[PDB]
């Protein structure tokens, strides 16, 4: 009845035309309304295979988010290699809305409903939908924010657990609230508050899950060994401002830990673009309180893989590849041609 196929999708959201928030604006121009009566048909006795690492859906979402960040977050001064490009840099209201990805006629989306599906292998519970769920195009690093939570277990997904260079997605079951704030009246100085209790607890649960994927070895957490600030720090956009949080505290086996954790954040104007090889400078931060309270719903890790001894294993945060962020939401979807 069907085969896997790569076709061009189309977006669908509930963006409001009167809204000034750029995500809403882009969506109203690029995407259609959501289905008011969405229907999902359970394929009984159907087992379907999935490979979340080869899903063209992700690639197409990537292209949308790039275009959206391009129309909505144009840099004042863009520096690609040696070229210097000056263009307007108006401050905008920037809060990501959910985007549904839908298939054209002749095609349909298969949705794996297995409770602890690692993204690759057979799905004993396949469903069929016309669109995916509402995915916020949240662009982050080290910490996946505002994503979908795992139902029942911490899930560990990697293209290749053996290849240390391959990123490790950590899908959490319980969110860890992170409250990041730039106080009103160094304008470039901010901080992210995290309840140390929850984080420590969650962090232990993920050690266990790592153990079961890595030979009950001892799990060690460390800050990133090096690289760009966007990678060595928890990077994310809040209200149009580019935050950089220092997550050194969050990633170390220290667990008086019941305390509140305050991460040193900085608002940057000069950044490295994730969209591609290029650097961008934006105007100084807006006035007044700048507060984003997000839910940490996943973690991006990277195993050292010394491959010298079985004494221990070490994990560090990373995740500059934003296709891994879309992958973490689109893992349960595939596009097939009827």
């Amino acid at each position, epitope marked *: 009845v069907w085969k896997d196929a790569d076709t061009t999708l189309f977006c669908a959201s509930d963006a409001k035309a009167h809204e000034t928030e750029c995500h809403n604006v882009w969506a109203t121009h690029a995407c259609v309304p959501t289905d008011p009566n969405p229907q999902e048909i359970h394929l009984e006795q159907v087992t379907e*295979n999935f*490979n979340m690492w080869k899903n063209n859906m992700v690639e197409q979402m990537q292209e949308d988010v790039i275009s959206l960040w391009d129309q909505c977050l144009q840099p004042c001064v863009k520096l690609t290699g040696g070229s210097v490009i000056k263009q307007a840099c108006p401050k905008i209201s920037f809060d990501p809305i959910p985007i549904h990805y839908c298939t054209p006629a002749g095609y349909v989306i298969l949705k794996c409903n297995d409770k602890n599906f690692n993204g*690759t*292998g*057979p799905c004993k519970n396949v469903s069929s939908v016309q669109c995916t769920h509402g995915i916020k195009p949240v662009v982050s690093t080290q910490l996946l924010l505002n994503g979908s939570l795992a139902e029942e277990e911490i899930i560990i997904r990697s293209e290749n657990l*053996t290849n*240390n260079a391959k990123t490790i997605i950590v899908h959490l079951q319980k969110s860890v609230e992170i409250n990041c704030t730039r106080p009103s009246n160094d304008i470039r100085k901010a901080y992210c508050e995290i309840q140390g209790t929850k984080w420590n607890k969650v962090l232990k649960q993920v050690t266990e899950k790592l153990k079961e994927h*890595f030979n009950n070895k001892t799990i060690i957490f460390q800050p990133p060994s090096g690289g760009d600030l966007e990678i060595t720090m928890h990077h994310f956009n809040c209200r149009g401002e580019f935050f950089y949080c220092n997550t050194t505290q969050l990633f170390q086996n220290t667990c008086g830990c019941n305390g509140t954790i305050t991460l040193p954040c900085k608002i940057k104007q000069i950044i490295n673009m994730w969209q591609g090889t290029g650097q961008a400078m934006y105007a100084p931060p807006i006035d007044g309180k700048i507060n984003c309270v997000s839910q940490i719903t996943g973690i991006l890790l990277t195993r050292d*893989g010394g491959a010298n001894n079985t004494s221990n294993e070490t994990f560090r945060p990373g995740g500059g590849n934003i296709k891994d962020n879309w992958r973490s939401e689109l893992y349960k979807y595939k596009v097939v041609q009827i």
Partner: antibody
Amino acid sequence: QIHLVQSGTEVKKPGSSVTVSCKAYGVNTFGLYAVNWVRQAPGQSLEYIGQIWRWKSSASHHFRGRVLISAVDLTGSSPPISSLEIKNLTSDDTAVYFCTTTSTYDKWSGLHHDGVMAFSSWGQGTLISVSA
Amino acid sequence: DIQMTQSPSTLSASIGDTVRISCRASQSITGNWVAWYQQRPGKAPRLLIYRGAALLGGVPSRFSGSAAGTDFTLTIGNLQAEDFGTFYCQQYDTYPGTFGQGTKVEVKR
């Protein structure tokens, strides 16, 4: 690409038990790749021993209870591993044993038929000599 | 339990010739679930054709398949050095997979 690397030659005596292993390098998961064990006696043709598919073990009725086929998925330290164990070894088990693997992802590929398939990727083979 | 019997046991062929190697099952295989392998001496067997006629990726187009009920046959055009060896037919219509006797394609002289 895929390269199935099998264990070394085994020279065992009658009645004993032997376990061989297949390291399926380049394989993403045995959830998409079925593993089939096939042996070939010296001067003879190939005979299918058994398999593991969707993490469900099986063997030809010719080897019921004498054969044990198991497999573990990809880990941080090693590729996917399959293993064949054989008890009550005889001189008629002096064949060269092959670990073979085949992708079962494309359900409508000609390769496989509901657990029964052709054998795409072949290992190096491992010789087992059973003699007193 | 299906039995595959091949014909002939061995055939002598020259370079460039077209080799026909047939194989027959104890019962009818509707799904055409048959494969053809080649085996070099001392080396593992290579898969050449699957599902009766479907030619595997990387394998020369000189290899052809033919599938009809109980009778299947491998056709090799423009034969060449690497082609000489032992060819096997296999059925995967029903459990368990069964091989043919094999066919030794050897240089005529």
